[PDB]
Every structure is written in C-alpha cells, then in structure tokens.
Symmetry: D2
Subunit: 232 residues, 4 copies
C-alpha cells in the first residue's frame, strides 16, 4: 500500500474508527486513526488556514488550523518522519465527502522542504489555474472558474456532492530526506473553505506526504479521506 503521513482536518466524527466524537484535527502516521488529535471548532462557510511544520531535529510534526478572530486549533506529534516516509515523496492535499458532504475548497497552498548539511523545494499557489500543470489531480479534484481547487465534487452552482474523493499532488517528487542530511524540514500552509448544507458536514481535508507514486486507494472514500485503503 502507499505510505501516508497526513495532517487531517476531519470535519466528521467516525467514532467507530477511532475519531473523537467531535470535528478534529489530527496527525496521521500510516493510519486514518490519528496518533494525535485536537478538537476543532470547525467554522463552516469561513476561510480557514492550516500551517503544518516539521523538522527532523525537533521531530515534532505540528499543525495549526485557524480562522480569523475565532479559533486556532493545534495538534503536535512527536515522530521521526524520516524513518516513516521514503526519501522521495509527493506532497498533496486530499479531501472526501461520504454520505454527508461539504465543499473542500482550497484557496491557496504553499509548501517548502529543505534538506541541509543541499536541496530545497518551495511552491506556492494563491490561486489555481484552469489547467494546473504542476498539479497531479486525482479523483474528483479540479480547479474551478474562480481559481479554487475543489478537491471534491461541487456542482455548477457550487453545491457540494457526497461520495466524492479528490487529491492534488505537487507534480515534482520532493526529496525529503537523504542519509547524509543534517536536517530536513518542511512547512506547508493552505487556506480552505468548507461550506455545507449538511447538519454534520463531512468528511474533511488533509495535507499529506506519501510515496511518489501515491494514488487514491480503492475503498478510501468518506472517513478514510482518500488516503487509506481501510481503517486499520
């Protein structure tokens, strides 16, 4: 299977697969069952910002998801990523809807990786082109006429659809560790807009890092956020 490290913004509590009973953010290391989570007071219809960081000395993957003036939710997990992930990876955003639904709209995304002693990679998109040639769009993901990356299916009127999954990967593999590296670090930020007509919107957005040839796993819809073939 793929190897996945992700920060999930999990709008829908699947308590039967170990979610806490409230929307949350989480760090997922090779499992949808987050190694650490924090309650997330999700604000439907407001633009959120997630900042994710790691470096290989501190070995603490952290994320903060905020909405202006209202909340900032943080979660951290200690982990040596460079023992979990392959040396080369692709980085991406995923999102799903399931029985319930929400827009999983990405308005901007930036990422920086540095490998020091050697390499760096930085990209940032404050809008997305109609044909984002440097994105690998998987499943339902497309960019819309406003320049937004719609991870999951939305109709022409902007309404979200259920049973959707989409991911966008940055086109270049990222060399996130090498044997002779002194320290490897990455930072990612994206802003997102989750709107939903559903009382319990679902399912959420992740920023994820995986093997380069990552693809949406069969069976990864809904609660598995397009990342995992099962809930193990």
């Amino acid at each position: 299977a793929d190897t996945i490290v992700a920060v999930e913004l999990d709008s829908y509590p699947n308590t039967d697969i170990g979610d806490p009973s409230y929307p949350h953010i989480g760090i997922d290391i090779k499992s949808v069952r987050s190694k650490s989570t924090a309650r997330w007071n999700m604000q439907t219809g407001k633009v959120g910002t997630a900042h994710i960081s790691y470096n290989s000395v501190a070995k603490r993957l952290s994320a903060v998801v905020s909405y202006t003036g209202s909340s900032s939710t943080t979660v951290s997990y200690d982990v040596d990523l460079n023992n979990v992930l392959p040396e080369w990876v692709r980085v991406g955003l995923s999102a799903t809807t399931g029985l319930y639904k929400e827009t999983n709209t990405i308005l901007s995304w930036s990422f920086t990786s540095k490998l020091k002693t050697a390499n760096s990679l930085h990209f940032s998109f404050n809008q997305f082109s109609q044909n984002p040639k440097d994105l690998i769009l998987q499943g339902d993901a497309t960019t819309d006429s406003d320049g937004n990356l719609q991870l999951t299916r939305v109709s022409s009127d902007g309404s979200p659809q259920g049973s959707s999954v989409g991911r966008a990967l940055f086109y270049a593999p990222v060399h996130i560790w090498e044997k002779s590296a002194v320290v490897a670090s990455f930072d990612a930020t994206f802003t997102f807009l989750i709107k939903s007509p559903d009382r319990d919107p679902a399912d959420g957005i992740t920023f994820f890092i995986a093997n380069t040839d990552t693809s949406i796993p069969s069976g990864s819809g809904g609660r598995l956020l397009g990342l995992f073939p099962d809930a193990n």
Copy 2:
C-alpha cells in the same frame, strides 16, 4: 518544434552558424544564433557560476558567468519572454559535445519563478542524488557518484566523450506567465565544471526554458547544444 529560450555558455565557436569567433555566452530566443553574445574567457578546469535573471516589467533577460577572482562575463537582451514562451514551461540545463568535447558538469542549480498581482516555484540542488526523481534526464545526462550532474557522457575515469548530448529538466512545469499577471520573474543560478583534454573544448552548457513537453531535437548535437533541430 519546441519553443526555446536559453542562455548558452558556448565554449566552441561555430562561426559558420553565426557564433562569434571566440567562446561566448549568449541569449538565444528560438534560435541557436544568439540574439546577443559576450566574449567569454572560459576557464577550463575551474568551477564557474552562471546567474540568469528576468522580469517581465524590465523585459531584460540577463546572464553573468563568473569564475572566482578571474572574470565575470555578462550578456543582456531585451525581450518580452512572455510573448515568446508558452504560459507553462519546463526549465532545464543542456549540454553537448560534438567532435570536440569537455565535461559539462553541473555542481548546483537553483531556479525561482514568481508570478505576481499568485504563484512561486523555487528549487535548488547543491548536489544531485543518484536517482534525481525531480529531474527529467534526457539523452546522456546522469548523475555521477560525486553527486554531480554530468550533462554529457563522461567515462568512469571522468574523461569527457564526444558526440554527446544531455539535458536535465526540472520535473514540475513552471507557470511563468498568466494573462492576469502583473509581473512574472525568474532567476536561475548553476555552477558548472568544464574540463577538457581538447585544445578547443566544445560545445557548451545552457540553461533553457521551453514548452513543457520539450525533448532533445533530432539533429541537435554539438553546436546546437541539444536545443534546436537546426541552425536557423
């Protein structure tokens, strides 16, 4: 054919296709016959550094190739690139040898493109991996066990071979212009080592920007630096 904009570090004077009669640096806009050139006092066996810059307001593509303490050769050409090139491009280095030869070794390469009003892309390599997954290596290009990108064929003992061509492209397409852009800029630097046993080494190195699906043209060896199908 491809659309090519390049800065060439042209070690070998092909005066029959319009080179000046001395090694030179040049700016090539859709032709091997540089729109502008400057004499280049090439220093075989010393590590050189090239810095190339452009922005769409100034519309002046400039390059400087230097060697520590000995020379700095500059060439500039006024050109609206964003009318020459497609909106999406790949950026790359090329090099060739022909009847005569030289190592066309790249020790580091960095590139930054920004599109403002929106996007940026930056990569830098101070060494290259044995399997540079974020490079598209074309023709003869490989990375060597010292971490160098050898654009053209070198033998196990490091000796350069003739009739070689190689290019390395950055894996991600780069969005170097969009209609609604206020200004688009790029900068590139690479350091290189050209060694040769030949009295008149050849043929040279370029940094080039092309259509995304650029490939080495048939017939582009030697004097055409792996960039053009002919000398027109």
Copy 3:
C-alpha cells in the same frame, strides 16, 4: 546632501519642476526630476500595489504600479545603481502632502536584496505594529490603529492633512553592493491606499534607497516627496 534613488508614485503634476502634466510614476536618480516617467491613472480610494526591481547585470530599475482589474503602469530606467548609491544604504518609503493632500497609507511592504558571487536581506510586513521597532519613522509617519503605516498625517477620523511629510526606513542598513560582488539585486513591493477629498490629490509616495543616515531634507515637503532639498 543625501544620495537618493527612488521610484515615485507622483499623484500631483508639478509641471514647473518638470513633472509631466498628469499623475505619473517615475524613477528618480538623485533628482526629483524623474529620469523616466509613465502616466499613472491613479485610482483614489482603491488599494494599489507597486513592485520595484533591479539587478546589477541587467541594470534596469523597473516599477509597476497596479490596481486590481483596472490598470498596470510600468516605468523602467537603465542605470547602474551601484555606481550611484553607496555600498550600504537604507531603504524606505516616503510620502508628502503639500497644499493639496491625500492619505499615503502603506498596507504592506516587502523588500529583498541579495549580493552574490554573500548576503541577503528580506523583510516583509503585511501589517505594521503600533510600535514598529524595526522601522525608523521620520517626520509625520506613524502607524495607525488598523495596522497601517500612515506616511503622512491623517486625523483621528482618517482624513488626510496638508503640508505633511513622513518616511519609514527599514532599521537595518542594507549592503547593496560590494566590489567583489558578481551581481546585486533588489526587489520591493508595497501596497498603498491613497484617499483624498481634494480634486487634485497630492503629493505622492516613494520607495527610496539612500545613504544609511538619510533624513528628511529641509525644504523637501510637497512636490519634493520628502526626498530632496530642492527641485534641481
């Protein structure tokens, strides 16, 4: 006197000191009488963005001032800055009002200088603190309770005042050239808001680079944009 290089966003045409007869942007090299200007369709009450760039190989100082969806005004001037300016400088924004007036509000400012072969400096402010300890505020300049840098005096109700001058300098000197530099480049962007009740607002905003110990010259009000002691 100071040595000044500036890009002026000159809202008020002082045709008696060589302004064109319309609002314009200009590049000023040691004189308020711009070496080059472009007509600027100034949009009072809308937020503008200026991007200024230079590098010492291309030797073309360029600026573009835009407002979203309405205009982009560009001006360029060929000049070897590193023969005009001292090796160390301070960079700043200035603005003035005179008999007529306008707000000269700066909402963000970023600047990057690189000296290559060696040094870089980058700062960016997307809002300004109540006590911007890394700004040297000269004359009337202050930051306001919205986080804006008000270059020239505004009253508590936000109304601009006449006969005002203010500048903000970045606190650190910037080493913008050294003898052994291969190339020196800088980029600056700032966004600004010029509002005025006056039919002919005045006087304008500049981004400027000067000797480190630059101060507002006596007599530099109004048309001289806080930069020059006279109109020579």
Copy 4:
C-alpha cells in the same frame, strides 16, 4: 537584567556551574545552566555548522551542530518562547574565552523569523564586511580581513586571546511574536571555526535572542558566554 534564550556551543565544561563534564551543546532559557544539553564532540580546527529552529506551535527549540562527515550533535527543549521573550528582540551570536581560549570565528550566519496569521525577516551573511553596518558588534567582536566575524579577540597572526567576550547582533529588532499571531517561527544557521592551542579550549559560542537593548552583562566573561551577569 536582559532576557536571554540561547543555544550554546559550550566548549569548556564548568562543572561547578552545572555544565556536564564534557563539551556540550545546550539550550539556555534565562540561565547559563542549560535546560537541556547534549554531548558535543567538538572538533577543533574544523568548520562546524549549527542549525537552530523553533516554531511556536511545536514549541520545541532545537539545535544541531555538525562537522562534515564526523558528527552531528542535537539538542531540543520544549519551551514556549513567546512566553519567555519579549515581542521584539535582537538576535545575535556571542562568544567568550576565559582563562582558556579558542578562536570563535563565524564564517556565515543566516536567520529567518516569520510571524503568521504578517511579518518576516531573513538575513544571511556568507562573509562579513570590514564594516558590517548591519551588525551591532559588542565587546571584542570584529570582522577580520578574511571576511570572518571574530567574536573574541584574535591576534594579527590569528591566535586566540583569553579573557575575551564579543557579540554581534543583527541591527534590526525582530518581531518574534504578536498577540494576534497564529504561529511564529525562526531558524538560524551559522558556521564557525574554533581553533585553539589549549588542551581544554574555552569557552564557546552561542546564538542568542534577547531584549532589543541587550548588552554584554558585566561579569559575563568566560563560562557565562557573554550572556549572563552570573551563573544562576
């Protein structure tokens, strides 16, 4: 007194003030008595590199000091810096010698701070000017004719002197936290050369962050690394 957070590269074990009995790196939060230390196999006469990072979500200040091919020493400490330090700070390097001595030569130094939701500051020096106008040199610190920052006194022949203290601060205050910040991060790297004729070289180098008006405390020589007025 000043408020000091530092990463110390402590070449000399002052076990009477709580040093471990071997050269070490340490994180010091308002005390010379490190909150955390790691054994440092100091390599006199070889160029070392220190990378220090922090961000306010992870709240883990980490440092790694390495020498090519021989060692990489890491130390981390969990700490909410933005509760320890003032919102505005100066960042600097310090070094001392005492009864014993060593060169505390800085060959390069870079620093990046970002405050997000807003501001960033980055500087890097790969050599230092004879008159580093953007450094506040305190005590003995000077730059030498090779472009190195000699924190502590060295004679014309390059030999280190005892009873020396010197610091260099970056000239601009750095806004490292604000109430409304979502996350604040900083990274610093410097490379250094510690040479000594002494069997037990002393005393060490730090990178430190302090109140803006920080100055070398009286009594801060030798073991107190120019940072603290006493060993408490």
